[PDB]
Design a protein around this ligand. Structure first.
Ligand SMILES: N#Cc1ccc(N2CCN(Cc3ccc(COc4cccc5c4CN([C@H]4CCC(=O)NC4=O)C5=O)cc3)CC2)c(F)c1
Ligand SMILES: [Zn+2]
Lengths: 1127, 384
């Protein structure tokens, strides 16, 4: 009775494994990346990575490797799923149809067995004879690799060592040999076995057991001619080959432990290492020893290359390029240049691939456009912690791109007879004025006859009477278009330098200093019309049509918009709006089918205003924050009607439906200067000149989600938004080492140590050299510039758990309430905490209130003007007294720690980490809490959210989602006090946070939409989901269409969708119920027309009277597009 | 407060040589399929919540129960003990199945008295209490399953820091600066993936299995000087059952811990009780202190509490305290059926209500604990 619909709004981004090899073809070099359920195949080239495929598998990739058996031209890919679905895939392409066929497939799980603590290990014999899997304690599962083994039948061999840490296959053995490190009460040991396929049991290893370091972690198999293995611990790296033995204890690696590695040489001469805090090491093997042709090791020199992102998987691409795959940071693509050494670093970054995970907290705010949501997350951890802003934007598709050295302005130019086709573009450097003619895809530039090479051009468009005016600071020169020769050139009347010149179809206004001239356009003549003088400096000018009934002017100091008659100096209107800085650019247009004038100041802000077509001025006062850089407003006709481009640090497109000018944030980092373009190669396109380069292309649909970063260099824990202060309150923590002086010195410049104003908590309500202690701060961050406006540091040994931004009682002020807990290493469960009420005003954080509680404040919410707190296992309600002091009102004692508190009306949903969901109701007529329903089931819960007054949604172990519903209409008390569970789903992601909101425009639409509500959830891998409700009829229709799609869509690896989505747990599995896979329903648009017809034959589509058994095919297209429009 | 010399050879009390010596033993174990309904006889005249793993001695005299024991042994060897609530007269909804391992039949006194020992094995729920006219009612029993959960970091773990999740053994044993420092790095390295989630490391330590068992072991050793691995199981399930058996708690709390189906929740509950429990008072009075919290020791490998049978068949759970308070003794110290091999019991009574709080176990030899052993029972003992 839940009938929900779950969809993914942004695919996972965190990388949990990457390989390279000749996968697409034997000649290409491919980089395969698994992010979770997605496998991305890129091709390594000199410029970088060129994506080739994105394929979504029906499971979480636990293991992949590339192997090439005999008789194969290109590598095959063995992928094992977290549900123990093994498969072997092969790339196959025919010109344009790109297919990954499944060579083999099969589930390899065991009926009984506890999965290993160290997890799944998947290794492949270097000679490609077998696949070894360590899935379970005390059992090595072997898959023979034969052409006839298309079902992947495997046998278990007993391992007597239950605690196996790391195992790999050795290189250069006549028969398959494994080497592994295991734990015994005597310590850690390294051992080797000889796996025999015929006998189906182990044998005696070539070199017997040797004792190793007590903290030996990883084994790496050195290939021929060295052989043997290298075991790396926390303090030493040892090389074993039987008789041959080496061991080193370098002090450079004692700081942190190595967690990842990747060979860089085909002969294994050098290796690449990465550690927990993110620095690259470089193991070196010396083959200087050669007695009688045998190559033997001689040293284990280790070199530190530099510092990178916190890496989970390393990989060496061709020509000194390393893809640093981060999971809790951002993916990188660095260079191992050994000659740069700018300050002692061997690495320099080339690219940076975005990674939203792990999303620890998130919030929805209407930053720019009212009604449309914007997502602000808390991504990364340690030094990669950041605030990430996710937005729907009208992405721009680029057709032809030619780099430019930061052009300072562009304008389309035509050097052909008038045919509505502009094959030229006059650039504008700082003082130079180049012109590049591009009839097709040409990029060569030739100087125009009518304009000098360097004259500091301001305006260069199409002059009247079939000419082309190429203006400059010195004089306004117009050159005849067809003759391509000058016909007129009028000098400035004041003989000064012209800064701002505006040209229209028939009238031109050029301003120098504080005086301007209006000139009419005449055939082969520049006939001056009049001249005028301004009281202050002319900051900007604009004449929008061809004689305009008004002119635009701004003051450098006063900064007031002045409008006056075009052919004279007679003023017509004026208005001053703030005037904080000089107005960067002012322009007027009729995008909304009405006369509107907009101004953009130097701070990036924009002020719209209204104007009359004939004569008259309107106010239409509104403030918009486009960006933090000057905005060069422009108009391009290749649009709906006119639209507007606001190029800034955050570019925007202004578009008005009836009378409300909405903003569409273009999906680009920076645009600087923009222009239209009507060239033959890219008709009705736009040419943008970014700071670094330039491009020419068109616009696209809203099918884009843009992520803008704000690095903090520390872990952000919780985030909240305060509207009245226009600020963000984010909790964060930094790691500081305990020096031998009684203090705590930091490790790197963090956002807490680089704020404008700083504070240290001072309350009186109540070791070893090298220990790391966590220091917690509350940062106040501006919502426009994203600069840390304040950083409050809490007491020592105080962990701040929760944070809410809300107003309490009758007090008009809004506060930040932070709940802390004093944690000490000696004691396990905190005994005392602190609820602190801050109030941000005038750029200063002041402690309004302090309350001392006996326990840890795990969560707080705003329950109808009364703060609802969870102190340990007791839920307490506080009233904000008129003396600005919290007062206890009601208590309720539970047997669980209220980790999760979610309210909707008068319904407190309480949870713990043991999936013990409890429901409470606050009866106000008496003032105490009452228990309504309860659902106790031992399992790990990650999050919980109240979908509505009856259904509650949560996430639990094995990456599952569940929906519990209370039957308030039950006539029996035991059922009334019980929460029936009515929905199960295997999401495949670990959800940390749920929040109500939507990232698309909130339009009522009268008829509304079949989906009711919207809840967004954030996962560890960096995937944002979206769950909505459905009616019974739509749920049934979508279920039928899903079952019919499962027989048409062929998945890679041939994993059944029912198995993949079935509610999974270590102890018990059930089929998915009450949940509709949005990804599958949305994939129905991508199938071919014969498959389109195969899917739909008897769905009984119509529900509004009749059934219409034909059901068509475009009706389901309309339904699926309606479901697509919701995210 | 008798430290150091605790010389008793503390394994005889868990052998019950008072209940016969040449006791016939039974080979091994059994197993009941999970989430299944079986028919189990209920032996009557027993009112106690038997935690799994807890030994229960029994003397049975009446012919019906003797014949019931006989036909049980010849067909399986399992019967049912019901966790009776505060209300008597078959007001039970949960219980545990006790399996026989020790048997003897005596023809003495012209009767076929049976001396039999059992240990609980499984946990169950009664659907309905069917009554049979013979006198030995059989219940239809639903096997309540045992839940064991993986590591809380297993879901959110990183695939690289997995080989760093096998810790070297605890250094030396039960030594300071070898625990407070070892546990800090253990927590730091085990829950490093708690940064990806929304909770601190210590919170996940509050739901860890090793950490909770360690805290219980520390507090228990603070009570009695335990021999480190003095039969304390490494398995969290068995450790939880042993600790639940040995806690001096009232009946409602035992029923509550019996309801709990996961080891971690049971351990958290046990810490809550034994951190919130200080005094034990006389139930019949609820006004007089006979005990305290720090004064609890163990002559049994099963802990400070054990089940013993008097020669009349009644079962008593006994708690050991150094110096009991507000108790008066009557009668010469006698040793006919003392459950401890070497002491002489004297019955003790409350200084006001005069209820059988327990016994004083005076010594006989001189290389013993001298006349300082109060084995107080639970019949009048409520936690306060
Ligand atoms: N139908 C039928 C039927 C048939 C036969 C029955 N037989 C009757 C005769 N019984 C022999 C006998 C009787 C009496 C004693 C004295 O001991 C007693 C007496 C009463 C209570 C307690 C004790 C000891 N004691 C504690 C003190 C603390 C400690 O350390 N250990 C203990 O045991 C008690 O609590 C010794 C032997 C054998 C059984 C029958 F009783 C029923
Ligand atoms: Zn009394």
């Amino acid at each position: 009775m839940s009938y929900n619909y779950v969809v993914t709004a942004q695919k996972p981004t965190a990388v949990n494994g990457c390989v390279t090899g000749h996968f697409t073809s034997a000649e290409d070099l491919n980089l395969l990346i698994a992010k979770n359920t997605r496998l991305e195949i890129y091709v390594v080239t000199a410029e970088g990575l060129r994506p080739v495929k994105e394929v979504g598998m029906y499971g979480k990739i636990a293991v992949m490797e590339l192997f090439r058996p005999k008789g194969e031209s290109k590598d095959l890919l063995f992928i094992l799923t977290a549900k123990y679905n093994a498969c072997i895939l092969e790339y196959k392409q025919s010109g344009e149809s790109i297919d990954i066929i499944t060579r083999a497939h099969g589930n390899v799980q065991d009926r009984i067995g506890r999965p290993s603590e160290t997890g799944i290990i998947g290794i492949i014999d270097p000679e490609c004879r077998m696949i070894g899997l360590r899935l379970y304690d005390g059992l090595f599962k072997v898959i023979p690799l034969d052409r006839d083994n298309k079902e992947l039948k495997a046998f278990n061999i007993r391992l007597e060592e239950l605690h196996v840490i790391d195992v790999k296959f050795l290189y250069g053995c006549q028969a398959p040999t494994i080497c592994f490190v295991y734990q015994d009460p005597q310590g850690r040991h390294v051992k080797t076995y000889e796996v025999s396929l015929r006998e189906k049991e182990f044998n005696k290893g070539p070199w017997k057991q040797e004792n190793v370091e007590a903290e030996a972690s990883m084994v790496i198999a050195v290939p021929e001619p060295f052989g043997g293995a290298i075991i790396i611990g926390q303090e030493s790296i040892t090389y074993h080959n039987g008789d041959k033995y080496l061991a080193i204890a370098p002090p450079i690696i004692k700081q942190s432990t190595i967690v990842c590695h990747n060979r860089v040489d085909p002969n294994g001469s050098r290796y690449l290492l990465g550690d927990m805090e993110g620095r690259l090491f470089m193991l070196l093997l010396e083959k200087e020893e050669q007695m009688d042709g045998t190559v033997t090791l001689k040293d284990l020199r280790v070199e530190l290359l530099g510092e990178t992102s916190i890496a989970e998987c390393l990989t060496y691409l061709d020509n000194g390029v390393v893809f640093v795959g981060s999971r809790l940071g951002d993916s990188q693509l660095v260079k191992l240049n050994v000659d740069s050494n700018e300050q002692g670093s061997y690495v320099v970054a080339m690219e940076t691939f975005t990674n939203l995970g792990p999303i620890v907290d998130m919030c929805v705010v209407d930053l720019e456009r009212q009604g449309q949501g914007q997502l602000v997350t808390c991504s990364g951890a340690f030094k990669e912690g950041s605030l990430r802003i996710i937005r729907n934007g009208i992405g721009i598709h680029e057709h032809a791109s030619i780099d430019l050295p930061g052009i300072k302005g562009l304008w389309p130019l035509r050097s052909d007879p008038n045919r509505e086709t502009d094959d030229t573009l006059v650039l504008s450097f700082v003082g130079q004025t180049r012109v590049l003619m591009l009839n097709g895809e040409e990029v060569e530039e030739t100087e125009l006859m009518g304009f000098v090479d360097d004259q500091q051009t301001f305006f260069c468009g199409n002059v009247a009477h079939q000419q082309l005016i190429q203006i400059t600071s010195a004089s306004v020169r117009l050159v005849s278009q067809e003759p391509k020769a000058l016909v007129s050139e009028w000098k400035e009347p004041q003989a000064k330098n012209i800064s701002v010149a505006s040209c229209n179809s028939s009238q031109v206004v050029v301003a120098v200093g504080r005086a301007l001239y209006y000139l009419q356009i005449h055939p082969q003549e520049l006939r001056q019309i009049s001249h005028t003088e301004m009281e202050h400096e002319v900051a900007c000018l604009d004449i929008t049509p061809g004689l305009s009934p008004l002119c635009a002017i701004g003051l450098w100091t006063d900064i007031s918009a002045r409008i006056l008659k075009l052919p004279s100096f007679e003023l017509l209107h004026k208005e001053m709006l703030g005037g904080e800085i000089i107005p960067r650019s002012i322009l007027m247009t009729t995008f909304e089918s009405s006369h509107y004038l907009l101004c953009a100041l130097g701070d990036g802000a924009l002020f719209y205003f209204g104007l009359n077509i004939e004569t008259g001025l309107l106010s239409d006062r509104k403030k918009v924050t486009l960006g933090t850089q000057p905005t060069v407003l422009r108009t391009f006709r290749s649009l709906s009607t006119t639209n507007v481009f606001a190029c800034s640090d955050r570019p925007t497109v202004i578009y008005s439906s009836n009378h409300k000018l909405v903003f569409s944030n273009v999906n680009l980092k920076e645009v600087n200067y923009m222009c239209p373009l009507n060239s033959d190669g890219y008709p009705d396109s736009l040419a943008l000149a970014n700071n670094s380069t330039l491009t020419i292309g068109t616009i696209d649909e809203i099918q884009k989600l843009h992520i803008r970063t704000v690095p903090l260099y520390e872990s952000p824990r919780k985030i909240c938004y305060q509207e009245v202060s226009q600020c963000f309150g984010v909790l964060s923590s930094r790691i500081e080492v305990q020096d031998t002086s009684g203090g705590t010195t930091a490790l790197r410049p963090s956002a807490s140590t680089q704020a404008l104003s700083s504070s240290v908590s001072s309350s009186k309500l109540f070791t070893s050299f090298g220990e790391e202690v966590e220091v917690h701060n509350l940062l106040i961050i501006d919502q426009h510039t994203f600069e840390v406006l304040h950083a409050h540091q809490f007491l020592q040994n105080e962990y701040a758990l929760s944070l809410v931004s809300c107003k309490l009682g009758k007090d008009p002020n809004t506060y930040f309430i932070v709940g802390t807990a004093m944690v000490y290493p000696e004691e396990a469960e905190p005994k005392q905490g602190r609820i602190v009420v801050f109030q941000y005003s005038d750029g200063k954080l002041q402690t309004v209130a302090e309350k001392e509680v006996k326990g840890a404040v795990y969560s707080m919410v705003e329950f109808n003007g009364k703060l609802l707190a969870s102190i340990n296992s007791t839920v307490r309600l506080y009233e904000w007294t008129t003396e600005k002091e919290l007062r206890t009102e009601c208590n309720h004692y539970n047997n669980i720690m209220a980790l999760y508190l979610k309210t909707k009306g008068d319904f407190i949903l309480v949870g713990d980490l043991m999936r013990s969901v409890l429901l409470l109701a606050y009866k106000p007529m008496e003032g105490n809490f009452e228990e309504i329903a309860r659902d106790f089931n031992p399992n790990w819960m990650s999050a919980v959210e109240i979908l509505d007054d009856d259904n509650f949604l949560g996430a639990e172990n094995a990456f599952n989602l569940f929906v519990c519903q209370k039957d308030s209409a039950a006539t029996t008390d035991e059922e009334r006090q019980h929460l029936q569970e009515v929905g199960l789903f295997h999401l495949g992601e670990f959800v940390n946070v749920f929040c109500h909101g939507s990232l698309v425009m909130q339009n009522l639409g009268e008829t509304s939409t079949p989906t009711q509500g919207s809840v967004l959830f954030g996962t560890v891998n960096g995937m944002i989901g979206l769950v909505t409700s459905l009616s019974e009829s739509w749920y049934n229709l979508l279920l039928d269409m899903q079952n019919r799609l499962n027989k048409v869509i062929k998945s890679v690896g041939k994993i059944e969708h029912s198995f993949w989505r079935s509610f999974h747990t270590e102890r018990k599995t059930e089929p998915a119920t009450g949940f509709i896979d949005g990804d599958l329903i949305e994939s129905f648009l991508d199938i071919s027309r014969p498959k389109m017809q195969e899917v739909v034959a008897n769905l009984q589509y119509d529900d509004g009277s009749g059934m219409k058994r034909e059901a068509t095919a475009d009706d389901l297209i309309k339904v699926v597009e309606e479901l697509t429009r919701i995210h | 407060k008798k430290p150091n010399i605790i010389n008793f050879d503390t394994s005889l009390p868990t052998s019950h040589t008072y209940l016969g010596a040449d006791m016939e033993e039974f080979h091994g174990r059994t197993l009941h399929d999970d989430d299944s309904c079986q028919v189990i006889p209920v032996l009557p005249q027993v009112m106690m919540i038997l935690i799994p793993g807890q030994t229960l001695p029994l003397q049975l005299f009446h012919p019906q129960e003797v014949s019931m024991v006989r036909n049980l042994i010849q067909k399986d060897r399992t019967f049912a003990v019901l966790a009776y609530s505060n209300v008597q007269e078959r007001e039970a909804q949960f219980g545990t199945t006790a399996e026989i391992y020790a048997y003897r039949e005596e023809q003495d006194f012209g009767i076929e008295i049976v001396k039999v020992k059992a240990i609980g094995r499984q946990r169950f729920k009664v659907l309905e209490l069917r009554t049979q006219s013979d006198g030995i009612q059989q219940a239809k029993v639903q096997i309540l399953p045992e839940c064991v959960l993986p590591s809380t970091m297993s879901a959110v773990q990183l695939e690289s820091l997995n080989k760093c999740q096998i810790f070297p053994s605890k250094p030396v044993s039960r030594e300071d600066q070898c625990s407070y420092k070892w546990w800090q790095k253990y927590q730091k390295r085990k829950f490093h993936c708690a940064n990806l989630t929304s909770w601190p490391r210590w919170l996940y330590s509050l739901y860890d299995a090793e950490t909770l068992m360690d805290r219980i072991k520390k507090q228990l050793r603070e009570w009695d000087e335990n021999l480190k691995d003095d039969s304390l199981p490494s398995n969290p399930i068995d450790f939880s059952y042993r600790v639940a058996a040995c806690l001096p708690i009232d009946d409602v709390l035992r029923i509550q811990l019996l309801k709990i189906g996961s080891a971690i929740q049971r351990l958290r509950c046990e810490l809550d009780i034994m951190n919130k429990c200080t005094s034990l008072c006389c139930k019949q009075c609820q006004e007089t202190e006979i005990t305290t919290k720090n004064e609890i020791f163990s002559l049994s490998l099963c802990g400070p509490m054990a089940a013993y049978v008097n020669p009349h068949g009644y079962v008593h759970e006994t708690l050991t305290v150094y110096k009991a308070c507000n108790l008066n003794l009557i009668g010469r110290p006698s040793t006919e059926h003392s459950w401890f091999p070497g002491y002489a019991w004297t019955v003790a009574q409350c200084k006001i209500c005069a209820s059988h709080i327990g016994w004083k176990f005076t010594a006989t030899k001189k290389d013993m604990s001298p006349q300082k052993f109060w084995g107080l029972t639970r019949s009048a003992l409520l936690p306060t």
